[model samples]
Target chain A: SAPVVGIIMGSQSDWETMRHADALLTELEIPHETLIVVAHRTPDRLADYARTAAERGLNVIIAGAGGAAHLPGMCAAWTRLPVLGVPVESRALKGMDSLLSIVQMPGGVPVGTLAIGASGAKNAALLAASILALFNPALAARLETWRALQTASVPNSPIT
Target chain B: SAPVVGIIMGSQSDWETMRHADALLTELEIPHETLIVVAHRTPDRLADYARTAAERGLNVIIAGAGGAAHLPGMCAAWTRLPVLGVPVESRALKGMDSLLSIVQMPGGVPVGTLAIGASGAKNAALLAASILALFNPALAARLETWRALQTASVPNSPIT
Candidate 1:
């Protein structure tokens, strides 16, 4: 099936973090594809991917990277499509460098950034679904049901 | 001098992130003190610290932690004073885990959470000052000067 969303990671090392995106997408029944596209390592490939992403019928792009994470911002610069950045936890600075790099984009270029890691990855999927649901009725209904179930799970009092 | 701001870290490890808070506070001319109180490692100490913080001249509490960071929320739970959480980047999930754990607190407990790392730390200091400035006219004047300096520091154009 033609995928509606694209999940791009900086390296194969990011699979562990991007997997959460895949899982959440799977749960949402959203057809998605994953690829390795390092912003620094392969600038040309990164440009090619960003330039061609929309042509491939992808509605949203989820990019995950660590350290000086320029993947999402670079991708957003190339494509007009909405980009969500997931700052994969890195070894040295624990993704702070990644998070700041991802979140603090100059005005005009906005990467609707999520939390940091797993929650960020998970929320990226949800946010994509929310955006896609704008034109997709079935997915919208599914999302509403999921949200209602989530709200229902909250208890009135903290568990002792 | 009686400290109006209390800066607490979950572990000594967070001192790195928390130092940004200290530097900002110093620049703002805000008197503050630091403490090591791990929510999970020493819950009793956390409870004691939070329970007595406000009465001891603490107007705002800035808590930094990593991993399954529960210190900020736990502190917010134990005190009526406003709490600000800095999600220090952790080992496993980066600071995303810490950011989510801090930002997504249950209702009735609010943590004015900043970004993941250093910028977040800087913003936390600014936000704390903003909060305190509500009652102190002299501090408010100082903050206005700081804001003017920040605005002046921005470059007009990107490097060619």
Candidate 2:
């Protein structure tokens, strides 16, 4: 199976947060590779990867970072691909800063930003799968089941 | 008597959102001003405003921006004064992007971030007042009343 999703994080430590994306994407059977590509440290690697991602058969990109997380927008700046940004919770600000840094791309560049931490990372994968499900009927069916199970897992009402 | 708080946004369009800060600050009678200081389009203005903020008698700075929101972080880089960031809702990504760009500053610079959109804006003002209240006994009393009123205003339960 050719890779359809590219998951990149700014630091190795970010795997703790972005692993949610990796798990759900795998659970949904979406082929992807999680790689460390720090924007501030490895700027050239980010540029090269993003620049050639489309030609390499990657359909969606998920970038996660904490504390001045610049990987997503910078990736978007280098490609026309749909990129999702996840805010990895930071130490001082509890990921609020990470959330703002990734989501606020300038006009013309778009990175669909998600909530902070694991939930955001999971939603990034979920959203990516939803996008791919548009063209892959088999995956679409799987996604429907995934979503149904998700819906069923919810409690109907509050309890004491 | 003078402006103890400077609530600045990047554009007049941001006024719709930043006005929440204005209204709450006004309610507490916290003398503050709202000014436009676009980071990209008006970099010089932002640099000057931030550099001089400390000496100008402003105790707290609330900076808000929608896309690639750099105003808050930039202000923090320039001034030692406490900067609280509000992530204004942007057109493309609905402020998730706005939130991250402002909150994620490196060590040595800090911008205490709040929630997304109007709620965040209102909280930014409240947080600013709380900081000032540490020094101004009268303002502290007023803020206490304001917070108690807010607590009392919450209803018992959600309505159908």
Candidate 3:
């Protein structure tokens, strides 16, 4: 089956962070695929994945990485497809390096950047679905329903 | 001497992130003071620090916290002074929680959020200094000089 979203992470270690993306996609019933293609560790694979991503019937790419994160940007460099970046938390400086590297792209290339870590991962999935929904009318309708449900769930006033 | 910037961290562990703020202040020659007061670990201290911060001659408060970070916003809630939040990278989410917790303040309370980790810490210092320079002409001159020096220091082209 043709995949709608491609979730790529820098390393298998990133599975911990990327899983949130998967869980959210599953919740949304979106068809997606996950790959461990490190921009630095496996440069060749990274290039190959980006080069062939669109041809493989993938609609959007969600790339999560940490520290000197270049995966999302590099992937966006190779493909015309919309690339979303998730700055996975790092050890030393947190993921500020990751966040800046992803968010501060030169004017031409744009990576629709998301929050760092789990929320970022979750939001990436949501954002991807939102983008795809632009073309899929049924999905858009469902999303609207979901939004209404979410709003209804909120209490009128805080407990305090 | 009155401190123009109040640097507060959630824990000693955050000293790694908070130190960047201190170093920036030192480099900028800004009068500042540091404190280790965790929102969760030491609620009373956090409350006391926030309550007394403005009257104690603090113009800007720089708060750094990790995990479910809340120090910065809480401080902003108590004082009219501008609070700059530095989201220290956390273990699980790399400071995404920290960033969201700090940046996504309610309408009434506002914490001018910075980038995550070290750069965020550095920018927090710069932002605090910038805020102070609004009222201090001497500091404003120093900041302008610093900006020129920074621009001059940048290489015209990438190193070979």
Candidate 4:
């Protein structure tokens, strides 16, 4: 199946966090490609990837980076497709640095950002599903069921 | 009085949020200066401001910006002084972008980041005050009283 969602990370280091996005996308049967795409180190690679993403049939892009994370923002700079950012925690400042770098694109360009670390990675996939669900009837049904189950499973009271 | 702390925002738009940092610092009687220093728009000005901040007797800096908020990171890059970052809320992403851009600095360059919008601005001031209080006994005592009052002000239970 053609990959509709592309998950890119700054380096292999980001895979630890980005794997969550991959796992969720897989669980929902969303075809996505996950790979390394450093913004600073591999500028040309990123430019080509983002520029070609739309014609390549990528509907959404999920980018994760840490410590001056710039992948998502730079990716969004070149692509018209919706770009979602997950701030992978850095060794020093946690994911604070990653979060700011990716999320704070100028007004003309936007990168929908998520929470830090694993939670953000999970949410990015869910968000991508939600976006795709707008026009994807089959995916919409699956996503609804997933959300319903999540809601139904929530406990009303705190555990002792 | 000579300014010991500096609060720099990218533009006047950020003043709305960074003003909280200003107000909190003023309330604590901390001598500080608040000014606008756009990172992208005025790189040389930022370079000079950050490079000479410590020599000018500034101990801490609180920087705020929204939408590709690079003020904090770029400032930290030029100075060794402790730099606190506040992500001013942007029109589109509600400061999520601002939060990430400022928080995610590389390891060697650090920016002590706060939450988004006013809370972050307020906290940046408090954090700066705490940093300065390490040597200024009078300010330390004032900060202690401020913290004590805040704690005491908290209600035992939530209102119905």
Candidate 5:
């Protein structure tokens, strides 16, 4: 099947964090496409990509970036599809810049933001899956099992 | 007496969150001033306030804002004083937007950011006191007492 979830980031450096989203989507058996889409550097490209994403069969978009990150917000601005944002840890502010840039969208435009770094990335995929699962009975079952395993894995007390 | 700390926010709506910082500063016996300084509505006023904060004997500034929050970063841009940011909770995005806008200052400028909402407002005051404590021995002893009391107050286990 063609990609239903599109995962885009500002640069290749973001791959390190975004790969978690890709991997989680894979483990959940969700069809997705991953790529580099710099909001500032490739403004026109982003506009074209996001504007046409729905026609291209993308149901949801997961965007990630660091340091004055604008990819997610811009992506949401161009498309009506629900967008999820991951704040990759930057060298200077440790993704705080990325987190704010993506999460703090003006009213009307919305980008459901996750925590910073890998946890945020993984959660982005999980959240995406949950969104998709609403219309996908098969995925709904897989996600439920995944969540149950996670809950079961937690120990009641510390090992030490 | 001249105020040692300054607390500024975008509007009266922000008074709710920024007030926690004011209350904490009062509890610490820290001489400070609180005011409404909308960054977008009155840019020149913000610039003038921050630029002269140091000369006014202000060592730290705590800024709080919601939505496309720019008060803290803009203040830091105009002043050399240490800036602490509290992301006041917004109607739509909770405090995520405010959090990112305040915490993600570029490399040259720095805003010591705290958690969102009330906790952040309170912590901003505590952090300001901690910073001043570095130079004031009496405040240092008081801060140490405050921290010790906080630590001692923590319960070993959750309530049944």
Candidate 6:
């Protein structure tokens, strides 16, 4: 069966932060596929992936990129599917540059951007789940359970 | 005296963040000038400004930009002067995209990137001052005083 979610990254190197998306999707029982796609290296492939994503049954697209992180915005340009951008931390400015490149799409295209690094990739997945949850009751219940556990994990005060 | 520091922005909209740099430089008595330089719209002006900056007696550059923010990195590419980048918040992705686009340099070129929005602009000023303070003990002492005040201003604990 095809996946409802697409987790695509700019390079194999981005797996460090992108894995959080895969993990959370697994936790929520969301079927997803991960693609090793580079916007600069494989422009046509990136284009085809985005333009054909809807037909392949993906409801959401989570794009992860570092350095000149153009994949997310480019992906948003090619598809109408809701896109979420994850800014992977890079060597020079951490993830600040990546965050900016991914999130600041022009007014016409939209990509809901999350924070930089791991929190971002995880948030991308959670946001996707939340979006899908809006229409699917079973997935919504799973997300609520996951969210409740998260809330329960927080302590009232400092442990130290 | 003509300002020794040149603070430039990509658009008029960027004044909201760049003003913080102007304020800090003012507080420290650093002579600085501010200008509007849009990377995409005025490519020749941006290039000439960077090329002639040092000849014009400017020692440092602080660049603030939003969206496809090419101002800071491009400035760095053209000049040997230490360029500081401040990622101004954008309408679509709130400056994350702006941060990545400005910070991630290929190698030989480098732009010292700061945080997103106002705090970043302030830090850029402080960093510029620090760079200038290297050759002037009087200014270094002034910088130390500013740091001491900042240290003392922090609260002991959260209000809540």
Candidate 6 Cα errors over 4 Å, as ranges: B1-66, B69-160
Task: Write one digit per residue (lDDT tens) for candidate 1, span B60-108.
Answer: 9999988778999999999999999999997666687789999999888
Candidate 2 per-residue lDDT, tens place, A1-160, comes to: 8889999997788999999999999999999988998664555577689889999999999999888776787678678889999989998879867866776566666889999999999999999999999999999999999999988999988997
lDDT, candidate 4, B42-78, per-residue tens = 5558767988999999999999988777678767867
Best by DockQ: 2
TM-score of each: 0.55, 0.55, 0.54, 0.56, 0.54, 0.55
Best by TM-score: 4
Looking at candidate 1, what is the lDDT of residue A131? 98
The residue ranges of model 1 lying beyond 4 angstroms of the native Cα positions read: A155-160, B1-160
Candidate 4 chain A, run of 10 with poorest lDDT: A38-47
- Tens-digit lDDT string for candidate 6 (B4-49): 8999997777898899999999999999999997654554577678
- iRMS, model 4 (angstroms): 5.2
In angstroms, the error of model 3 at A74 is 18
- Give the 10-residue window scoring lowest on summed lDDT in candidate 2 chain A: A38-47
lDDT of 4: 0.86
Candidate 3 stretches greater than 4 Å from native: A1-160
lDDT of 5 at B92: 79
lDDT of 4 by residue, A5-49 (tens): 999998887888999999999999999898898654455577689
Error of 1 at B98 (Å): 7.1
lDDT by residue for model 1 (A55-115), tens: 9898999999998999999999999999999999888777779899999999999999886
lDDT of each: 0.89, 0.85, 0.86, 0.86, 0.86, 0.85
- Candidate 3 lDDT over A34-112, as tens digits, reads 8777775467678898999899999999999987799999999999999999999876656887899899999998899
lDDT of 5 by residue, A1-160 (tens): 8999999997888999999999999999999999998654455577689889999999999999887676787677678899999988999678777777777665667899999999999999999999999999999999999999999999899979
Output the lDDT of residue A132, model 5. Answer: 96
In Å, residue A124's CA in model 3 sits off its true spot by 24
Off by over 4 Å in 2: A1-66, A69-104, A108-160, B157-160
Q: Which ten residues in a row have the lowest lDDT in candidate 4 chain B?
A: B100-109
